């Protein structure tokens, strides 16, 4: 789309929109992130506050596979399984769904949200938040620890 470019509409305007006094020189402020702490310091401090310096210790080789764990919050367990099965677990008070969250692909169960009152539900996960446990037990369910 080179015919939509703004330069085309400055075709006979001498300065090409880049100014008559200041001109368009090449790197008049330095290259890349050159002037940080010196003459681009205001830009750096105004838009990237904590840029300079270092904090914390070093993790030499990380291996993110070790600590990878996705989280599902407590208000999505009932939405994990289909609607007619929600209905069928709802009207019947003698059965509860057992959801292996790990199989859907989450490792930890977090506690944000609201479970349905007096609706037991059993959840299997590798990790649980304490509030997630409290809510699951409060609705009459149980948290099963799995690996």
């Amino acid at each position: 789309a080179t015919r939509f470019k703004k330069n085309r509409k400055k075709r006979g305007h001498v300065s090409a929109g880049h100014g008559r006094v200041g001109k368009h020189r090449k790197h008049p402020g330095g290259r890349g992130k050159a002037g940080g702490l010196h003459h681009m310091r205001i830009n750096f401090d105004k838009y990237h506050p904590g840029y300079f310096g270092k904090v914390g210790m070093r993790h030499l080789n990380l291996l993110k596979n070790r600590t990878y764990c996705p989280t599902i919050n407590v208000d999505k367990l009932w939405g994990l399984l289909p609607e007619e099965k929600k209905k069928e677990f709802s009207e019947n008070k003698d059965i509860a769904p057992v959801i292996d969250v790990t199989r859907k692909g989450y490792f930890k169960v977090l506690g944000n949200g609201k479970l349905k009152h007096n609706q037991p539900i059993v959840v299997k996960a590798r990790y649980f938040s304490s509030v997630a446990e409290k809510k699951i037990k409060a609705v009459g369910g149980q948290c099963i620890l799995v690996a």
């Binding site: 401090d45 105004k46 838009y47 990237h48 506050p49 904590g50 840029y51 300079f52 310096g53 270092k54 904090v55 914390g56 208000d75 999505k76 009932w78 939405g79 994990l80 609607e83 929600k86 949200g113 349905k116």
Partner: protein, 186 residues
């Protein structure tokens, strides 16, 4: 020579015509600004104005917020110019009569099973040309991520602007100017 602001020409701001070249949306805009012009309804005027808006100003509305907003009046019709998205966090729907520009497949199916129905704006014009018993709703316009970077610059005192960074580890823009231990903080 005469001393007038803007040389005497009234200046308006915002959209004047729809940018979308969607034929169905163009027909909708024609119908609804005809309705706004002819009827007195501020309802119709607002709908015609909102049909014109950019995508970021007709945000999706979840079924949860739809139900919550329509909680008190159950017999009226929720009219939303954005799209309607399904909320998995919601356990149960109830009998919703909603007119919207677009419906998600999941949200549509949930509404039909709950027993309500999904309405388009041409049907809304056909049945409620003035807007009796129609509650005008819209989703969160300032909730999108791009707005989290706006406002005071990140670095101004008491600024909640989210910066533009590659990633958010400890070694990415977290040392000098973000904690008292390194020079200042914010």
């Amino acid at each position: 020579g005469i001393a007038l602001k803007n040389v005497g020409r009234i200046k308006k701001h915002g959209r004047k015509h729809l940018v979308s070249k969607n034929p169905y949306l163009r027909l909708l805009v024609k119908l609804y600004n005809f309705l706004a012009r002819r009827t007195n309804a501020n309802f119709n005027k607002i709908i015609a104005k909102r049909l014109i808006m950019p995508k970021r100003y007709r945000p999706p509305l979840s079924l949860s917020k739809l139900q919550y907003h329509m909680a008190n009046h159950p017999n009226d019709i929720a009219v939303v110019v954005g799209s309607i998205t399904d909320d998995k966090r919601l356990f149960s729907l109830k009998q919703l009569k909603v007119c919207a520009l677009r419906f998600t497949e999941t949200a549509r199916k949930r509404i039909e099973d709950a027993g309500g129905e999904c309405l388009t704006f041409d049907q809304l014009a056909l049945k409620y040309p003035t807007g009796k018993k129609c509650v005008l709703l819209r989703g969160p316009t300032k909730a999108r991520t791009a707005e989290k970077h706006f406002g005071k610059a990140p670095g101004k005192p008491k600024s909640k602007a989210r910066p533009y960074v590659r990633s958010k580890g400890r070694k990415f823009e977290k040392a000098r100017g973000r904690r008292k231990s390194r020079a200042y903080k914010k």
